[PDB]
Amino acid sequence: QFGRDIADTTDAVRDPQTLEILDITPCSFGGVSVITPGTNTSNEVAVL
């Protein structure tokens, strides 16, 4: 009915209605990093 990764994270499921098979991928997340020169030089920034 459902599938596990090497570390026992669940990573696939059957739809119980149409018995086709779905992968589960986490919703994307990550660090917002601000690239800045020194404030003395400029107030402009770029965001990674």
């Binding site: 986490p26 997340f29 990550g30």
Partner: protein, 49 residues
């Protein structure tokens, strides 16, 4: 799952450019490229040093 893997700053195809520069210095210029100047020297004379 909260866990992340960040990339290295020097990519593997760019570490391999430094190892190439280090041995291409070593093969053409002995140790001298450590002491600032890459002085060429023919290799059978480097091995005599």
């Amino acid at each position: 799952n909260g866990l992340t893997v960040l990339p290295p700053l020097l990519t593997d195809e760019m570490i391999a450019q430094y190892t190439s520069a280090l041995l291409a210095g070593t093969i053409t210029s002995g140790w001298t490229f450590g002491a600032g100047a890459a002085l060429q020297i023919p290799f059978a004379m480097q091995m005599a040093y």
